Design an enzyme around this catalytic site. Structure first.
Site, PDB file in Angstrom:
ATOM      1  N   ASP A 121       0.819  -1.192   0.000  1.00  0.00           N
ATOM      2  CA  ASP A 121       0.000   0.000   0.000  1.00  0.00           C
ATOM      3  C   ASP A 121       0.867   1.262   0.000  1.00  0.00           C
ATOM      4  N   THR A 159      -7.028   2.887  -2.098  1.00  0.00           N
ATOM      5  CA  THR A 159      -6.675   1.523  -1.834  1.00  0.00           C
ATOM      6  C   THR A 159      -7.672   0.528  -2.391  1.00  0.00           C
ATOM      7  N   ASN A 180     -13.027   4.976  -1.486  1.00  0.00           N
ATOM      8  CA  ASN A 180     -12.739   4.424  -0.133  1.00  0.00           C
ATOM      9  C   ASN A 180     -13.930   4.759   0.758  1.00  0.00           C
ATOM     10  N   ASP A 308      -0.648  -0.421  -5.006  1.00  0.00           N
ATOM     11  CA  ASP A 308      -2.020  -0.005  -5.355  1.00  0.00           C
ATOM     12  C   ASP A 308      -2.013   1.456  -5.880  1.00  0.00           C
ATOM     13  N   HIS A 309      -1.106   2.298  -5.364  1.00  0.00           N
ATOM     14  CA  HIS A 309      -1.016   3.716  -5.710  1.00  0.00           C
ATOM     15  C   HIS A 309       0.238   4.291  -5.022  1.00  0.00           C
ATOM     16  N   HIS A 420      -3.231  10.607  -1.182  1.00  0.00           N
ATOM     17  CA  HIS A 420      -3.308  10.113  -2.523  1.00  0.00           C
ATOM     18  C   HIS A 420      -4.750  10.043  -2.898  1.00  0.00           C
ATOM     19  N   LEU A 689     -18.941   2.961 -24.277  1.00  0.00           N
ATOM     20  CA  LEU A 689     -19.212   2.057 -25.396  1.00  0.00           C
ATOM     21  C   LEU A 689     -20.057   2.819 -26.448  1.00  0.00           C
ATOM     22  N   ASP A 691     -22.713   4.167 -28.839  1.00  0.00           N
ATOM     23  CA  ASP A 691     -24.173   4.196 -28.795  1.00  0.00           C
ATOM     24  C   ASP A 691     -24.762   3.598 -30.076  1.00  0.00           C
TER      25      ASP A 691
HETATM   26  C1  LIG Z   1     -15.341  -3.198 -18.704  1.00  0.00           C
HETATM   27  O1  LIG Z   1     -15.598  -4.631 -18.796  1.00  0.00           O
HETATM   28  C2  LIG Z   1     -16.889  -4.995 -18.308  1.00  0.00           C
HETATM   29  C3  LIG Z   1     -17.033  -6.494 -18.137  1.00  0.00           C
HETATM   30  O2  LIG Z   1     -16.943  -7.125 -19.419  1.00  0.00           O
HETATM   31  C4  LIG Z   1     -17.984  -4.410 -19.202  1.00  0.00           C
HETATM   32  O3  LIG Z   1     -19.187  -4.483 -18.422  1.00  0.00           O
HETATM   33  C5  LIG Z   1     -20.159  -5.358 -18.956  1.00  0.00           C
HETATM   34  O4  LIG Z   1     -20.864  -4.689 -19.990  1.00  0.00           O
HETATM   35  C6  LIG Z   1     -21.962  -5.381 -20.614  1.00  0.00           C
HETATM   36  C7  LIG Z   1     -22.776  -4.395 -21.571  1.00  0.00           C
HETATM   37  O5  LIG Z   1     -23.054  -3.126 -20.941  1.00  0.00           O
HETATM   38  C8  LIG Z   1     -22.940  -5.932 -19.541  1.00  0.00           C
HETATM   39  O6  LIG Z   1     -23.685  -6.937 -20.242  1.00  0.00           O
HETATM   40  C9  LIG Z   1     -25.031  -7.232 -19.727  1.00  0.00           C
HETATM   41  O7  LIG Z   1     -25.392  -6.716 -18.434  1.00  0.00           O
HETATM   42  C10 LIG Z   1     -26.565  -7.428 -17.932  1.00  0.00           C
HETATM   43  C11 LIG Z   1     -26.221  -8.681 -17.084  1.00  0.00           C
HETATM   44  O8  LIG Z   1     -25.801  -8.124 -15.826  1.00  0.00           O
HETATM   45  C12 LIG Z   1     -25.729  -8.946 -14.632  1.00  0.00           C
HETATM   46  O9  LIG Z   1     -25.040 -10.215 -14.777  1.00  0.00           O
HETATM   47  C13 LIG Z   1     -23.602 -10.164 -15.016  1.00  0.00           C
HETATM   48  C14 LIG Z   1     -22.951 -11.594 -15.229  1.00  0.00           C
HETATM   49  O10 LIG Z   1     -22.503 -12.416 -14.088  1.00  0.00           O
HETATM   50  C15 LIG Z   1     -22.991  -9.247 -13.907  1.00  0.00           C
HETATM   51  O11 LIG Z   1     -21.601  -9.103 -14.089  1.00  0.00           O
HETATM   52  C16 LIG Z   1     -23.587  -7.820 -13.791  1.00  0.00           C
HETATM   53  O12 LIG Z   1     -22.866  -7.027 -12.770  1.00  0.00           O
HETATM   54  C17 LIG Z   1     -23.136  -5.588 -12.687  1.00  0.00           C
HETATM   55  O13 LIG Z   1     -24.274  -5.237 -11.890  1.00  0.00           O
HETATM   56  C18 LIG Z   1     -24.090  -5.445 -10.462  1.00  0.00           C
HETATM   57  C19 LIG Z   1     -25.240  -4.696  -9.793  1.00  0.00           C
HETATM   58  O14 LIG Z   1     -26.383  -5.336 -10.324  1.00  0.00           O
HETATM   59  C20 LIG Z   1     -22.770  -4.948  -9.796  1.00  0.00           C
HETATM   60  O15 LIG Z   1     -22.513  -5.615  -8.532  1.00  0.00           O
HETATM   61  C21 LIG Z   1     -21.530  -5.051 -10.691  1.00  0.00           C
HETATM   62  O16 LIG Z   1     -20.526  -4.104 -10.196  1.00  0.00           O
HETATM   63  C22 LIG Z   1     -21.928  -4.730 -12.146  1.00  0.00           C
HETATM   64  O17 LIG Z   1     -22.158  -3.276 -12.118  1.00  0.00           O
HETATM   65  C23 LIG Z   1     -21.841  -2.665 -13.400  1.00  0.00           C
HETATM   66  O18 LIG Z   1     -22.597  -3.097 -14.579  1.00  0.00           O
HETATM   67  C24 LIG Z   1     -24.001  -2.665 -14.727  1.00  0.00           C
HETATM   68  C25 LIG Z   1     -24.638  -3.251 -16.025  1.00  0.00           C
HETATM   69  O19 LIG Z   1     -24.678  -4.730 -15.902  1.00  0.00           O
HETATM   70  C26 LIG Z   1     -24.058  -1.121 -14.595  1.00  0.00           C
HETATM   71  O20 LIG Z   1     -25.391  -0.609 -14.622  1.00  0.00           O
HETATM   72  C27 LIG Z   1     -23.389  -0.691 -13.290  1.00  0.00           C
HETATM   73  O21 LIG Z   1     -23.244   0.694 -13.136  1.00  0.00           O
HETATM   74  C28 LIG Z   1     -21.961  -1.182 -13.135  1.00  0.00           C
HETATM   75  O22 LIG Z   1     -21.143  -0.532 -14.066  1.00  0.00           O
HETATM   76  C29 LIG Z   1     -25.106  -8.012 -13.567  1.00  0.00           C
HETATM   77  O23 LIG Z   1     -25.317  -8.565 -12.262  1.00  0.00           O
HETATM   78  C30 LIG Z   1     -27.580  -7.785 -19.048  1.00  0.00           C
HETATM   79  O24 LIG Z   1     -28.886  -7.869 -18.461  1.00  0.00           O
HETATM   80  C31 LIG Z   1     -27.560  -6.791 -20.224  1.00  0.00           C
HETATM   81  O25 LIG Z   1     -28.610  -7.157 -21.183  1.00  0.00           O
HETATM   82  C32 LIG Z   1     -29.492  -6.108 -21.760  1.00  0.00           C
HETATM   83  O26 LIG Z   1     -28.888  -5.506 -22.932  1.00  0.00           O
HETATM   84  C33 LIG Z   1     -28.797  -6.487 -23.999  1.00  0.00           C
HETATM   85  C34 LIG Z   1     -27.861  -6.053 -25.127  1.00  0.00           C
HETATM   86  O27 LIG Z   1     -27.374  -7.241 -25.772  1.00  0.00           O
HETATM   87  C35 LIG Z   1     -30.175  -6.855 -24.578  1.00  0.00           C
HETATM   88  O28 LIG Z   1     -30.082  -7.986 -25.472  1.00  0.00           O
HETATM   89  C36 LIG Z   1     -31.199  -7.217 -23.496  1.00  0.00           C
HETATM   90  O29 LIG Z   1     -32.475  -6.758 -23.999  1.00  0.00           O
HETATM   91  C37 LIG Z   1     -30.961  -6.604 -22.096  1.00  0.00           C
HETATM   92  O30 LIG Z   1     -32.006  -5.586 -22.114  1.00  0.00           O
HETATM   93  C38 LIG Z   1     -32.978  -5.588 -21.019  1.00  0.00           C
HETATM   94  O31 LIG Z   1     -32.480  -4.761 -19.932  1.00  0.00           O
HETATM   95  C39 LIG Z   1     -32.368  -3.380 -20.349  1.00  0.00           C
HETATM   96  C40 LIG Z   1     -31.436  -2.519 -19.467  1.00  0.00           C
HETATM   97  O32 LIG Z   1     -30.154  -3.189 -19.202  1.00  0.00           O
HETATM   98  C41 LIG Z   1     -33.835  -2.917 -20.499  1.00  0.00           C
HETATM   99  O33 LIG Z   1     -33.997  -1.490 -20.578  1.00  0.00           O
HETATM  100  C42 LIG Z   1     -34.439  -3.613 -21.752  1.00  0.00           C
HETATM  101  O34 LIG Z   1     -35.658  -2.916 -22.232  1.00  0.00           O
HETATM  102  C43 LIG Z   1     -34.431  -5.152 -21.419  1.00  0.00           C
HETATM  103  O35 LIG Z   1     -35.335  -5.543 -20.344  1.00  0.00           O
HETATM  104  C44 LIG Z   1     -26.116  -6.853 -20.759  1.00  0.00           C
HETATM  105  O36 LIG Z   1     -25.957  -7.928 -21.657  1.00  0.00           O
HETATM  106  C45 LIG Z   1     -22.250  -6.514 -18.288  1.00  0.00           C
HETATM  107  O37 LIG Z   1     -23.157  -6.602 -17.150  1.00  0.00           O
HETATM  108  C46 LIG Z   1     -21.083  -5.676 -17.780  1.00  0.00           C
HETATM  109  N1  LIG Z   1     -20.369  -6.325 -16.673  1.00  0.00           N
HETATM  110  C47 LIG Z   1     -19.865  -5.675 -15.609  1.00  0.00           C
HETATM  111  C48 LIG Z   1     -19.166  -6.639 -14.647  1.00  0.00           C
HETATM  112  O38 LIG Z   1     -19.915  -4.433 -15.370  1.00  0.00           O
HETATM  113  C49 LIG Z   1     -17.701  -2.927 -19.496  1.00  0.00           C
HETATM  114  O39 LIG Z   1     -18.550  -2.593 -20.567  1.00  0.00           O
HETATM  115  C50 LIG Z   1     -16.194  -2.657 -19.850  1.00  0.00           C
HETATM  116  N2  LIG Z   1     -15.943  -1.255 -20.052  1.00  0.00           N
HETATM  117  C51 LIG Z   1     -15.447  -0.693 -21.180  1.00  0.00           C
HETATM  118  C52 LIG Z   1     -15.307   0.827 -21.218  1.00  0.00           C
HETATM  119  O40 LIG Z   1     -15.148  -1.445 -22.109  1.00  0.00           O
HETATM  120  C1  LIG Z   2      -9.787  -1.117   7.455  1.00  0.00           C
HETATM  121  O1  LIG Z   2      -9.323  -2.381   6.928  1.00  0.00           O
HETATM  122  C2  LIG Z   2      -8.491  -2.424   5.850  1.00  0.00           C
HETATM  123  C3  LIG Z   2      -8.125  -3.713   5.459  1.00  0.00           C
HETATM  124  C4  LIG Z   2      -7.299  -3.735   4.399  1.00  0.00           C
HETATM  125  C5  LIG Z   2      -6.877  -4.938   3.746  1.00  0.00           C
HETATM  126  C6  LIG Z   2      -6.693  -6.209   4.333  1.00  0.00           C
HETATM  127  N1  LIG Z   2      -6.228  -7.144   3.396  1.00  0.00           N
HETATM  128  C7  LIG Z   2      -6.126  -6.406   2.230  1.00  0.00           C
HETATM  129  C8  LIG Z   2      -5.566  -6.950   1.009  1.00  0.00           C
HETATM  130  O2  LIG Z   2      -6.703  -7.086   0.088  1.00  0.00           O
HETATM  131  C9  LIG Z   2      -6.357  -7.366  -1.172  1.00  0.00           C
HETATM  132  C10 LIG Z   2      -5.039  -7.696  -1.531  1.00  0.00           C
HETATM  133  C11 LIG Z   2      -4.802  -8.021  -2.818  1.00  0.00           C
HETATM  134 CL1  LIG Z   2      -3.212  -8.544  -3.251  1.00  0.00          CL
HETATM  135  C12 LIG Z   2      -5.854  -8.022  -3.752  1.00  0.00           C
HETATM  136  C13 LIG Z   2      -5.728  -8.446  -5.121  1.00  0.00           C
HETATM  137  N2  LIG Z   2      -5.539  -8.810  -6.266  1.00  0.00           N
HETATM  138  C14 LIG Z   2      -7.111  -7.677  -3.314  1.00  0.00           C
HETATM  139  C15 LIG Z   2      -7.389  -7.342  -2.075  1.00  0.00           C
HETATM  140  C16 LIG Z   2      -8.795  -7.023  -1.695  1.00  0.00           C
HETATM  141  C17 LIG Z   2      -9.347  -8.317  -0.907  1.00  0.00           C
HETATM  142  C18 LIG Z   2      -9.762  -6.835  -2.898  1.00  0.00           C
HETATM  143  C19 LIG Z   2      -8.998  -5.701  -0.875  1.00  0.00           C
HETATM  144  N3  LIG Z   2      -6.542  -5.049   2.434  1.00  0.00           N
HETATM  145  C20 LIG Z   2      -6.653  -4.062   1.439  1.00  0.00           C
HETATM  146  N4  LIG Z   2      -6.817  -2.596   3.760  1.00  0.00           N
HETATM  147  C21 LIG Z   2      -7.246  -1.438   4.202  1.00  0.00           C
HETATM  148  N5  LIG Z   2      -8.083  -1.277   5.225  1.00  0.00           N
HETATM  149 CA   LIG Z   3      -3.679   2.085  -0.388  1.00  0.00          CA
HETATM  150 CA   LIG Z   4     -22.758   4.412 -24.875  1.00  0.00          CA
END
Ligand SMILES: *[C@@H]1O[C@H](CO)[C@@H](O[C@@H]2O[C@H](CO)[C@@H](O[C@H]3O[C@H](CO[C@H]4O[C@H](CO)[C@@H](O)[C@H](O[C@H]5O[C@H](CO)[C@@H](O)[C@H](O)[C@@H]5O[C@H]5O[C@H](CO)[C@@H](O)[C@H](O)[C@@H]5O)[C@@H]4O)[C@@H](O)[C@H](O[C@H]4O[C@H](CO)[C@@H](O)[C@H](O)[C@@H]4O[C@H]4O[C@H](CO)[C@@H](O)[C@H](O)[C@@H]4O)[C@@H]3O)[C@H](O)[C@H]2NC(C)=O)[C@H](O)[C@H]1NC(C)=O
Ligand SMILES: COc1cc(-c2cnc(COc3cc(Cl)c(C#N)cc3C(C)(C)C)n2C)ncn1
Ligand SMILES: [Ca+2]
Ligand SMILES: [Ca+2]
Ligand SMILES: [K+]
Ligand code: NA
Length: 804
Positions: A121, A159, A180, A308-309, A420, A689, A691
């Site tokens: 860290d 971190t 954070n 990490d940074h 940071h 991505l 549009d």
């Molecule tokens: C960085 O790399 C990542 C990973 O590859 C990439 O992110 C992926 O982008 C894809 C396209 O945007 C997207 O595909 C589908 O999303 C959902 C499925 O989502 C769930 O299941 C997966 C699989 O295990 C999960 O990973 C996903 O996690 C997300 O949501 C969680 C909260 O729910 C959260 O914990 C986690 O952090 C993550 O959050 C992020 O993603 C979401 C979007 O998923 C954002 O909103 C968040 O802000 C955050 O950024 C989910 O749990 C599908 O349902 C989609 O399907 C749509 O669109 C289709 C197009 O083919 C279409 O066919 C369908 O009709 C469907 O439409 C329906 O739903 C519409 C609205 O969505 C609705 O209006 C419509 O009318 C109809 O009902 C997508 O296929 C991935 O989820 C996404 N993954 C992750 C991990 O973020 C990034 O794009 C890149 N970045 C760059 C710059 O390249």
């Molecule tokens: C207040 O408590 C704390 C607790 C901690 C803390 C305790 N153990 C870790 C190491 O975590 C990691 C270490 C590695 Cl090598 C990778 C990877 N790849 C990912 C993680 C996470 C699991 C995602 C955080 N941290 C950050 N740090 C600040 N504050």
């Molecule tokens: Ca740190």
């Molecule tokens: Ca877009």
């Protein structure tokens, strides 16, 4: 509620978590108040410290000791790390000569070289050089393995965002750990550094390496360490796991150090007090490497030493207060510090106005040490917008500064001398990477890269298939001695049309005019050759970009430029042209100021029109191939085709014209020619991505002409600048940008002055990678070069940072 009255006997640092309300004996147990009553006694032994001394050599095993010096210790897997040195005449790993590890040299039963991630860290990149005299073990990993001069973190440079990025290969906006501290408006819940809320799984999106491994039948160690477990015991635990039976033993492990961050916050990055924390981390590396050598694993395991940074000089007196700018300061909540995020004190308030908050924070004092943004207007390279946890209003804080709501926030909490979290391009935030082992290269320096890339490589190191992530798989192949990943180019989805002359001038009713009725056979075949592709080898140097989605588009050739023209969006997707060192800048002739010409290769119905620009009082137009860089008076007429026009706010045309009229020629002179690809980007939902059409929120008034959110350029030359851009035998050099298409220049506080004092500075802030533009366009560049695909993938991830 736990029943904490089971026992940790024979279960210390067990690998599977036993669920409530059995009591637990793993690293998480402290942090959940869930350890069995005898955990400290059995699992956290300390007696006699952590080093063998001559007197303990061959001792009789005493199970109370922290670690052992008894003859049975190697078989038990619990010797002190210096056992062999003190008791068997062996050398410390650091004192041994560096010797190339051509093949893994592992004990029988090892199916694959293990991976150990040693994370530190706040480990700033320059510590490698400035602290070299006190970190011998680290310096040996670095010089004998593979190292970068620095590694680029993600924004924010905090971190948890960076460690979870390391574990997932995802930007914070996608994995969900966007700071954070975070308020989720659906959870009505804050996430902080202290507290148990952070332990809920709902925060942590994507698929981290330990889950990737476990789903694919590769076993993992703990990645999280409780703070009160001392480092010496974390090392011994890893070394003990490494002695488990074949079927029980993990293949991937992590160690984490809270230092040197902890001290850096108190003393600043180069405080005299920082020498000791660097010495202590180095000692810890020495313990692991001596423990590996005892177990005969020091030429089997791949070690990643990674930060990490970094850490910057930051003090209480360098705080900007929102109380000095706003009147309504009690109607907001600020996430403060090295970044700002602002939202409404109460969502019961249709009286909250972001527009007014932004304007009260824009260019208000001459010295101002922050800049407000709507999140969708942040530099696209930060990838920091597409998450509900990221507030609409963002403050980018200058390095060395803080932001806070009011003075009392800062004294009713000087403590600190370091911090940071700034923009991930800032030199003081850069961190470290070293890879050492059979699978990394020997004594190799690689260029700086981004930490989003490492997930794919760790998966490669372990024979895993990576979950979908933001790295570019193959871009880091040059780190590895043996790669299991051989990338191939994406298939082209849409083939272009090559239209000829198909329309008479009088078929167009575009409301355009041009003074162009100014009539030789020597130059009549010659111009036909140009419209058929005869200069194309000069202007399209790396093949045509591949379109990776279903659409309808035409290739248009010209003497001076080639374009890929979209019949759907009524403008080029891309426009490609080469400007040699020798080329001349000319003006737009007076008689051609308002000239716009129908293109007889493209239907009226797939063309833009001048009337709409006339009726649209906000919107004007520019050109993608710049008329200033025409090769001849006659070629200049090609620059005013309706197929080369794009919608541009007057405020934005100031930026664009300066770029086209002054900067392209500057770059050609400095870089010995440049090849330019320019085009529009549409990202109205700020997901990074391309549009679809049905996602566009703005058109030129009264038309189907879509308004770009941004404009890009990719500027390529020969890395060996003794060769001209258009005759380059070797590796390429690139810089790129993604400029926001904004109706004002409020982002630039000096925009009332001459473009020579502000435009380049803007463009530098909006520097981008080719890969960022690929995501935003659905195009694939550099398809026809003489270079390997891996090298090309490294070039597409390059970012020109403009730091010194
Ligand atoms: C960085 O790399 C990542 C990973 O590859 C990439 O992110 C992926 O982008 C894809 C396209 O945007 C997207 O595909 C589908 O999303 C959902 C499925 O989502 C769930 O299941 C997966 C699989 O295990 C999960 O990973 C996903 O996690 C997300 O949501 C969680 C909260 O729910 C959260 O914990 C986690 O952090 C993550 O959050 C992020 O993603 C979401 C979007 O998923 C954002 O909103 C968040 O802000 C955050 O950024 C989910 O749990 C599908 O349902 C989609 O399907 C749509 O669109 C289709 C197009 O083919 C279409 O066919 C369908 O009709 C469907 O439409 C329906 O739903 C519409 C609205 O969505 C609705 O209006 C419509 O009318 C109809 O009902 C997508 O296929 C991935 O989820 C996404 N993954 C992750 C991990 O973020 C990034 O794009 C890149 N970045 C760059 C710059 O390249
Ligand atoms: C207040 O408590 C704390 C607790 C901690 C803390 C305790 N153990 C870790 C190491 O975590 C990691 C270490 C590695 Cl090598 C990778 C990877 N790849 C990912 C993680 C996470 C699991 C995602 C955080 N941290 C950050 N740090 C600040 N504050
Ligand atoms: Ca740190
Ligand atoms: Ca877009
Ligand atoms: K107009
Ligand atoms: Na301005």
């Amino acid at each position: 509620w736990t029943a904490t009255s089971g026992s940790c006997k024979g279960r210390c640092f067990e690998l599977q978590e036993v669920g409530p309300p059995d009591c637990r004996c793993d690293n998480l147990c402290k942090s959940y108040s869930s350890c069995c009553h005898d955990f400290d006694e059995l699992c956290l032994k300390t007696a006699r410290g952590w080093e063998c001394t001559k007197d303990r050599c061959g001792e009789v095993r005493n199970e109370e000791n922290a670690c052992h010096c008894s003859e049975d210790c190697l078989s038990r897997g619990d010797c002190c790390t210096n056992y062999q040195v003190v008791c068997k005449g062996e050398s410390h790993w650091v004192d041994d000569d560096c010797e190339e590890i051509k093949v893994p040299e592992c004990p029988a039963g090892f199916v694959r070289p293990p991976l150990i991630i040693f994370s530190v860290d706040g480990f700033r990149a320059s510590y490698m050089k400035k602290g070299s005299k006190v970190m011998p073990n680290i310096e040996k990993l670095r010089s004998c393995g593979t190292h970068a001069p620095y590694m680029r973190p993600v924004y924010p440079t905090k971190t948890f965002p960076n460690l979870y990025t390391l574990a997932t290969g995802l930007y914070p906006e996608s994995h969900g750990i966007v700071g954070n501290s975070m308020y989720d408006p659906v959870f009505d819940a804050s996430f902080h550094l202290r507290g148990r809320e952070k332990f809920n799984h709902r925060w942590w999106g994507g698929q981290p390496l330990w889950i990737t491994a476990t789903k694919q039948g590769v076993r993992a160690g703990t990645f999280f360490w409780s703070v009160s477990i001392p480092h010496e015991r974390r090392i011994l635990t890893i070394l003990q796991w490494l002695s488990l039976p074949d079927n029980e033993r993990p293949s991937v492990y992590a160690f984490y150090s809270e230092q040197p961050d902890f001290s850096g916050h108190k003393y600043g990055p180069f405080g005299p007090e920082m020498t000791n924390p660097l010495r202590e981390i180095d000692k810890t590396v020495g313990q692991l490497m001596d423990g590996l050598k005892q177990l005969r694993l020091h030429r089997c395991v791949n070690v990643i030493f990674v930060g990490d940074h970094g850490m910057e000089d930051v003090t209480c007196d360098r705080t900007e207060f929102l109380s000095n700018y706003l009147t309504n300061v009690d109607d907001i909540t600020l996430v403060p510090g090295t970044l700002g995020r602002i939202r409404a004190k109460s969502i019961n308030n249709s009286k909250y106005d972001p527009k007014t908050i932004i304007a009260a924070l824009t260019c208000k004092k001459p010295d101002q040490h922050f800049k407000p943004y709507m999140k969708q207007h942040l530099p696209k390279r930060l990838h920091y917008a597409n998450n509900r946890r990221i507030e609409d209003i963002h403050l980018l804080v200058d390095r060395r500064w803080h932001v806070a709501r009011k003075p009392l926030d800062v004294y009713k909490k000087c403590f600190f001398q370091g911090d940071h979290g700034f923009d991930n391009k800032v030199n003081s935030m850069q961190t470290v990477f070293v890879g050492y082992g059979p699978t990394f290269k020997y004594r190799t320096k690689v260029p700086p890269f981004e930490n989003i890339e490492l997930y794919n490589v760790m998966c490669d190191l372990l024979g895993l298939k990576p979950a979908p992530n933001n790295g570019t798989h193959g871009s880091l192949n040059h780190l590895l001695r043996t790669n299991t990943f051989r990338p191939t180019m994406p298939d082209e989805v849409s083939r272009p049309n090559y239209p000829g002359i198909m329309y008479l001038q009088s078929e167009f009713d575009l409301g355009c005019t041009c003074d162009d009725k100014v009539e030789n056979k020597l130059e009549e075949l010659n111009k036909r050759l140009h419209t058929k592709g005869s200069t194309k080898e000069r202007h399209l140097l790396y093949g045509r970009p591949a379109v990776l989605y279903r659409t309808s588009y035409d290739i248009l050739y010209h003497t001076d430029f080639e374009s890929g023209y979209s019949e759907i969006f009524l403008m080029p997707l891309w426009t490609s042209y080469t400007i040699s060192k020798q080329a001349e800048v000319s003006s737009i002739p007076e008689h051609l100021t308002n000239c716009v010409r129908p293109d007889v290769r493209v239907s009226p119905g797939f063309s833009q029109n001048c009337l709409a620009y006339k009726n649209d009082k906000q919107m004007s137009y520019g050109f993608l191939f710049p008329p200033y860089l025409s090769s001849s008076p006659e070629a200049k007429y090609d620059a005013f085709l309706v197929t080369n026009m794009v919608p541009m706010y007057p405020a934005f045309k100031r930026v664009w014209a300066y770029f086209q009229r002054v900067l392209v020629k500057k770059y050609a002179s400095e870089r010995n020619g440049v090849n330019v690809i320019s085009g529009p980007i549409f990202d109205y939902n700020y997901d990074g991505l391309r549009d679809t059409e049905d996602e566009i929120k703005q058109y030129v008034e009264g038309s189907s002409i879509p308004v770009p959110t941004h404009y890009y350029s990719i500027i390529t030359s020969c890395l060996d600048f003794t060769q001209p851009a258009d005759k380059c035998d070797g590796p390429l050099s690139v810089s790129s940008f993604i400029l926001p298409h904004r109706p004002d220049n409020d982002e630039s506080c000096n925009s009332s002055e001459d473009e020579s004092k502000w435009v380049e500075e803007l463009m530098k802030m909006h520097t981008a990678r080719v890969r960022d533009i690929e995501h935003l366009t659905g195009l694939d560049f550099y398809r026809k070069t003489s270079r390997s695909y891996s090298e090309i993938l490294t070039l597409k991830t390059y970012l020109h940072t403009y730091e010194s």
